[PDB]
Amino acid sequence: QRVEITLRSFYIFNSTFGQVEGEEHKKVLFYHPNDIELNTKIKDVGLSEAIIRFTGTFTSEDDCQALHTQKTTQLFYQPEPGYWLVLVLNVPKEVRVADYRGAEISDRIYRAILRQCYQMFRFQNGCFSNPDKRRELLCQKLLQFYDQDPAQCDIIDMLHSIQYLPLDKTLFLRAQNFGTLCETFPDIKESIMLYQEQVLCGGKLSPEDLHCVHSYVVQHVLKVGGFVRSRPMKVYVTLDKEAKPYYLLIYRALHITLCLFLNADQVAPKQDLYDDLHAYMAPQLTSLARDISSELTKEAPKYLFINEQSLQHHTNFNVLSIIADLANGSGAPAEEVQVKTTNDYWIVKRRCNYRQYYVILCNSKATLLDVTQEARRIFEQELTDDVFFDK
């Protein structure tokens, strides 16, 4: 009778506030769920602060990272000095008496999730830094964010990668041609083009900002023929060594989403600009989308080839024990790791200059040499321009 991981609590606190007696409720800036009594909130914040101050007697205070009780595990994270995020989890149970199996949880995945939460909040609203009363009401953005699965997490969600879109040269040159908008219209500072879910042509932007833009677009615009209007939306992205606000304009062709970054130190754009952009851009974008769709219509061991410099993976994705091993052995010179599990699964890993390769095999009648040969066959079949210098 498996119970698997659930979510028990999530809160943000700042110990600086409420140093005077009787203001113990000023610590909490957010608590989830909101149905809990105030005393329990204060007790949980007190426990977290006690653990942090106990750790802070051997090393630096900003080193605390986790707690493992018998049935709940907590994760700490400090994005800015003073502010802490905590993610209480629930240990899976096994019934045969209760058999807690809190040894099947990898802290890296959920700590990465904690990182992504703050990254998205920063993208939309900015940094965390009375103003605390404004902040506490602006933090009820993290109410729909945790309303829109904890058990289903893997290495891809740990590394924040997006799949790769292969295109022929002519279509790519045609698509990249949409860079004359910054010249015909001097106001536009940046443009990014997406296919349905893969990034088609996004340039002059760091991978983190591109991931944030892609995640926001997929979450809002795609899930729930021209300029999509929401019921002047500002974003905070870093360009030229500084994070600055920018207006975001989203234009939707058939399957193509084109995000335009207008300058945000002037007044909001008027209707004439929208009309000009529409009448200047609609037909070419429609034709390009139709051509790409037609071309894409014209066009056992697993694998997963991850790139660490652009966060674009390429896979064809395995029991839970196998999935747990991939997230364990992951990240410096090259290396080569081969592992066989009890249930007869062979796992091979390579690490070239900046990449990671994985191959999973299911063969119980193989030796070390046979497995190496099979992995080499797969690597040669699914890749060109041999990178390992196998010769």
Partner: protein, 418 residues
């Protein structure tokens, strides 16, 4: 400086009374003990039990057993389960010094009773047990015996060992209530004979080894002291007659009996055993082996295989270990720590309960390691960084064949019986 150490061991009471600390004075650290007790009680108020804390390079492990609080902190590469095993060893040491019934009754008595009174004069055993690791200054294989929880057997030809065992079991046959007779020499078991219906468990044997190694007053007298074996009987005592063999053969013999009055009989039996050993020239073989620095046969075997730095082979039926001598480039301390970390990591990954493995092959920058867990043995080899794979497999197979050939010389299959 105090907080920069590589290992800390704190022992508390359920009320928060300091008892033992590996570093520093137990009375200078009252506030830390109070903080720990408050934290544990605070967590327990929610019908829950705290186990560990991971904080960016430092790990803490907690244990609450029989109204005691055991806390261990370590900056090494050890995981939390291995620290829990270490804490269990410390608790077993405490349980051996004070039998379980005595401590449970005294705790059922006044709740604020200081246990340092009853644990006075036995700090040497704790310090030896916690210094048995290579963290501070030690360059030996006791860390390798601790990691895999097994002992090492003295390498002698089968004839000498059979003669010694036959002599002991023939001389000590008529005595009533003799449970175990153990003969060890230089931190290495030589022979062991036990009663038919009662066996021994590796934890108790390692405890006996620690008691013999730490104490030094066993050489100048025929000491008669009691010992408690938690696995044998956790509420009853055993009385041990401990004495060395002679002034030229430094092998120590222990006779364990349940009767507190039978001591002269044990002395007479020991005298007869030593006489019958000296008659048949076994002491000469023991002394000759004690002078060899590195067991030249295994040295020749290892040097016969280049691109091999270290290994440790352990069978599955019994808890015994075989490993060669430390050689270059691992003769320093930093490289020794690195090698210890490598074995810790491999051992933790192989024996993980949630996701166990069967074979690990790695080709890191400065080494080529290999682990293996067959149904009848368990190997952990380390090769040179620029070796191919077929050569590694050939060397491993040849080494395993040689080890299987010379089995009775290095391992004991079945123990003797009275």
């Amino acid at each position: 400086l105090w907080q920069g150490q590589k290992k800390h061991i704190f022992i508390l009471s359920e009320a928060g009374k300091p008892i033992f600390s590996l570093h520093g004075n137990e009375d200078k650290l009252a506030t830390l003990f109070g903080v720990i007790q408050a934290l544990v009680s605070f967590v327990q108020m929610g019908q829950d039990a705290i186990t560990s804390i991971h904080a960016g390079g430092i790990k803490f492990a907690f244990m609450q057993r029989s109204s005691l609080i055991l806390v261990a902190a370590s900056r090494s590469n050890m995981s939390v389960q291995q620290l829990q095993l270490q804490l269990g060893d410390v608790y077993n040491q405490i349980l051996s010094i004070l039998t379980y019934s005595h401590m449970t009754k005294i705790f059922e008595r006044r709740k604020n009773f200081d246990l340092r009174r009853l644990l006075s004069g036995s700090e040497r055993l704790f310090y030896n047990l916690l210094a048995n690791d290579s963290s501070s200054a030690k360059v030996s294989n006791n860390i390798f015996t601790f990691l895999t929880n097994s002992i090492r057997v003295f390498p002698l030809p089968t004839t000498i060992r059979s003669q010694i065992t036959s002599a002991i079991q023939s001389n000590c046959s008529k005595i009533k209530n003799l449970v175990f007779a153990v003969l060890i020499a230089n931190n290495k078991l030589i022979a062991l004979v036990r009663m038919k219906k009662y066996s021994i468990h590796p934890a108790d044997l390692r405890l006996i080894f620690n008691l013999v190694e730490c104490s030094e007053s066993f050489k100048s007298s025929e000491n008669w002291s009691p010992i408690c074996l938690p696995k044998f009987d956790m509420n009853g005592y055993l009385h041990a007659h401990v004495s060395y063999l002679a002034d030229d053969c430094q092998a120590c013999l222990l006779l364990l009996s349940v009767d507190r009055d039978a001591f002269f009989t044990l002395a007479e039996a020991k005298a007869k055993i030593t006489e019958k050993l000296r008659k048949s020239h076994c002491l000469e073989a023991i002394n000759e082996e004690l002078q060899q620095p590195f067991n030249a046969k295994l040295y020749q075997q290892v040097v016969g295989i280049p691109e091999l730095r270290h290994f440790l082979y352990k069978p599955k039926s019994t808890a015994q270990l075989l490993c060669p001598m430390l050689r270059h480039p691992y003769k320093s301390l930093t490289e020794l720590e690195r090698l210890e970390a490598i074995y810790c990591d491999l051992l933790h990954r192989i024996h993980n309960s949630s996701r166990p493995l069967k074979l690990i092959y790695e080709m890191k920058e400065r080494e080529v390691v290999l682990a293996w867990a067959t149904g009848t043995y368990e190997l952990y080899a380390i090769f040179e960084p620029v070796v191919d794979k077929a050569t590694v497999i050939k060397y491993v197979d040849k080494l395993i064949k040689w080890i299987e050939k010379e089995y009775d010389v290095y391992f004991i299959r079945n123990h003797a019986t009275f």
